[PDB]
Amino acid sequence: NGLKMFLAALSLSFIAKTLGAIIMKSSIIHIERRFEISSSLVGFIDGSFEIGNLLVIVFVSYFGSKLHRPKLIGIGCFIMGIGGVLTALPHFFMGYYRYSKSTLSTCLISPEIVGKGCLKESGSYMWIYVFMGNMLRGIGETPIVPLGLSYIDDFAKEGHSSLYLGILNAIAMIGPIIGFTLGSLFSKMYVDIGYVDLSTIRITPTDSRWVGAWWLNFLVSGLFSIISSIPFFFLPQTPNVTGFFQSFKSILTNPLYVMFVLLTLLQVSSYIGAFTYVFKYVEQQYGQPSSKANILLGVITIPIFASGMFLGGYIIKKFKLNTVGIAKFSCFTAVMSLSFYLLYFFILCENKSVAGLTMTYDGNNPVTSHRDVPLSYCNSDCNCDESQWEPVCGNNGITYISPCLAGCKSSSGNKKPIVFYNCSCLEVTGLQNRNYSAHLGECPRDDACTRKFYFFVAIQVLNLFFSALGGTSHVMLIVKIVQPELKSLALGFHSMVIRALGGILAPIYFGALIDTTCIKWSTNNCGTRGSCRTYNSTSFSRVYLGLSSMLRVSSLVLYIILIYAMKKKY
Ligand SMILES: C=CC1=C(C)/C(=C\c2[nH]c(Cc3[nH]c(/C=C4\NC(=O)C(C)=C4C=C)c(C)c3CCC(=O)O)c(CCC(=O)O)c2C)NC1=O
Ligand SMILES: *[C@@H]1O[C@H](CO)[C@@H](O[C@@H]2O[C@H](CO)[C@@H](O)[C@H](O)[C@H]2NC(C)=O)[C@H](O)[C@H]1NC(C)=O
Ligand SMILES: *[C@@H]1O[C@H](CO)[C@@H](O)[C@H](O)[C@H]1NC(C)=O
């Protein structure tokens, strides 16, 4: 055995860290509904992990490179566990969830939550516990990648180093699996499960204001991190201050390293943003929210991604590759991924033709600007709230904003069918089997586009496999181009850059440039602002895919320069 024992312990810690991350990112809606926490504060609670990890991922990645790396990893996992337990803590202190607990809109002739929440948050509201409990995860997660991997790449064999990193990044996928299954098994248990008799709880997952046993999940994450930290306290050191600024200057002055950091920042920002908004893209362009984007995609994706990471490691090992070799392999990965992106632009469909946003409500003449579209002879008599968004589809295949705007005055209502009838707007032609009708929901797109949806899913799985075939190349190329005694600080600073400029900023400006294309903004009662109901299909696609491809092209260009400069140096 030997280093293999540390490898197993570090794999367990990877599982714990990924499970913690996903189980924090899966309980946002639950906690929010049981805490009188304005979404704005929920964003801050979620960013607690970042504000904790950033201030430390360097100060512990250099000072730890000299003092018994395994014990530091163990203290880190133990801190992560205590953080999870302290996150689940507030459930035993507060009271019961006693605060547990239409609009057909046919046409015819103050801060209350924050106010009560603020009152509830008059002092240090219980929410702070979660925030801090989450921040601890940061302070505990940081000595795993920088302080662990260095160890391996400094105590392994000459070529083995890579296969291990592949095995670690491929076992870390057992994290999201156990997280998803344990959440969807636990998000079905009422918040106060065991305390209250579950036969009286009226609220249901189908109904609103339902809260599950959220304290049990963070508790599980905590117990799992603690059980993963127990083994680390037994491995040995070696299995056989005006210095910090000095080393940091000598690692930033290194041209190859800063060039590679900028490159990986660009590329990883592009991926992260693409995978953050790919679901909204699939929904807005084709019209398949969860037809194939459902858990199925997850169970078919996880084995692919794991196989990608492991094959990347194995190919870096089996096929002996020098530093230039790893650079060329990563560049080939980037070329294949960018070719797939530049393929995506050929899989596109027509725009969602909805009355009032792209055409006049009559459906005859297209309108240029959706702002100030005049009402037609359909409804000028029908008092219709123009801000309401209730997509309905008639026999003509045209989507409408609201059944009121549809020109309808009747609906099944209590009866199960959603059909509407008698509406001047659907009356486009004559003697054409004009049995005016309308079903609830957006117009389902013709088979010609759902067929392209499968092309999209296929090339997306292929591009995720080809981008996971190189996900074990960044760390190796970083450890190889930095001086031998600075690997940990290199990995730490690189994780800082990747997380603080590709995990916090990339979704932000992607969301901004995407919201540049919104056509209908849910106006709010407190303000005209809100979420977006629909995006212009072709313009949203263009903006999103174009920004992603531009980032990828800048990345690939840097790769060329880097491989060049590197081949010049060596
Ligand atoms: C439909 C299938 C499905 C998927 C794919 C899923 C999660 C999922 N999303 C991503 C991409 C992936 N990767 C990152 C981030 C990073 N990646 C990095 O290597 C670094 C250093 C960062 C920075 C923090 C993000 C944010 C996402 C997309 C997350 C999401 O929006 O779901 C991965 C690959 C690992 C990863 O990149 O973290 C996984 C397992 N859940 C599902 O149900
Ligand atoms: C829907 O609209 C039609 C037309 O206004 C309503 O009825 C009639 O149409 C047929 C054929 O022209 C005839 O019975 C009369 O000319 C119309 N008057 C009525 C009310 O009988 C029909 O009743 C409406 N049905 C609804 C309310 O869904
Ligand atoms: C209208 O009549 C046609 C037959 O001409 C029938 O197929 C269709 O289901 C009817 N639709 C409505 C709205 O009743």
UniProtKB/Swiss-Prot annotation:
Glycans are attached at N351, N422, N435, N536. Residues 25-43, 194-211, 273-292, 345-456, 515-548 are extracellular. Changing E112G: Decreased transport activity. Residues 65-70, 154-172, 317-320, 480-488 are cytoplasmic. GO terms for cellular component: basal plasma membrane; basolateral plasma membrane; membrane; plasma membrane. It is found in: Basolateral cell membrane; Basal cell membrane. The chain crosses the membrane at residues 5-24, 44-64, 71-95, 125-153, 173-193, 212-236, 251-272, 293-316, 321-344, 457-479, 489-514, 549-566. It is a multi-pass membrane protein. Keywords: Cell membrane, Disulfide bond, Glycoprotein, Ion transport, Lipid transport, Membrane, Phosphoprotein, Transmembrane, Transmembrane helix, Transport. Changing L149R: Strongly decreases expression at the plasma membrane; abolishes transport activity. One of its GO terms (biological process) is heme catabolic process. Changing V130A: Decreased transport activity. Disulfide bonds join C378-C408, C384-C404, C393-C425. It catalyses: taurocholate(out) = taurocholate(in); dehydroepiandrosterone 3-sulfate(out) = dehydroepiandrosterone 3-sulfate(in); estrone 3-sulfate(out) = estrone 3-sulfate(in); 3,3',5'-triiodo-L-thyronine(out) = 3,3',5'-triiodo-L-thyronine(in). Residues 372-427 form the Kazal-like domain. Highly expressed in liver, at the basolateral membranes of centrilobular hepatocytes. Expressed in liver (at protein level). Expressed in fetal liver. Not detected in heart, brain, placenta, lung, skeletal muscle, kidney, pancreas, spleen, thymus, prostate, testis, ovary, small intestine, colon and leukocyte. In testis, primarily localized to the basal membrane of Sertoli cells and weakly expressed in Leydig cells and within the tubules. Gene3D superfamilies: 3.30.60.30, MFS general substrate transporter like domains (1.20.1250.20). It is linked to Hyperbilirubinemia, Rotor type: An autosomal recessive form of primary conjugated hyperbilirubinemia. Affected individuals develop mild jaundice not associated with hemolysis shortly after birth or in childhood. They have delayed plasma clearance of the unconjugated anionic dye bromsulphthalein and prominent urinary excretion of coproporphyrin I. Hepatic pigmentation is normal. A conserved histidine residue in the third TMD (His-91) may play an essential role in the pH sensitivity of SLCO1B1/OATP1B1-mediated substrate transport. This is Solute carrier organic anion transporter family member 1B1. It comes from Homo sapiens (Human). The lineage of its organism: Eukaryota, Metazoa, Chordata, Craniata, Vertebrata.
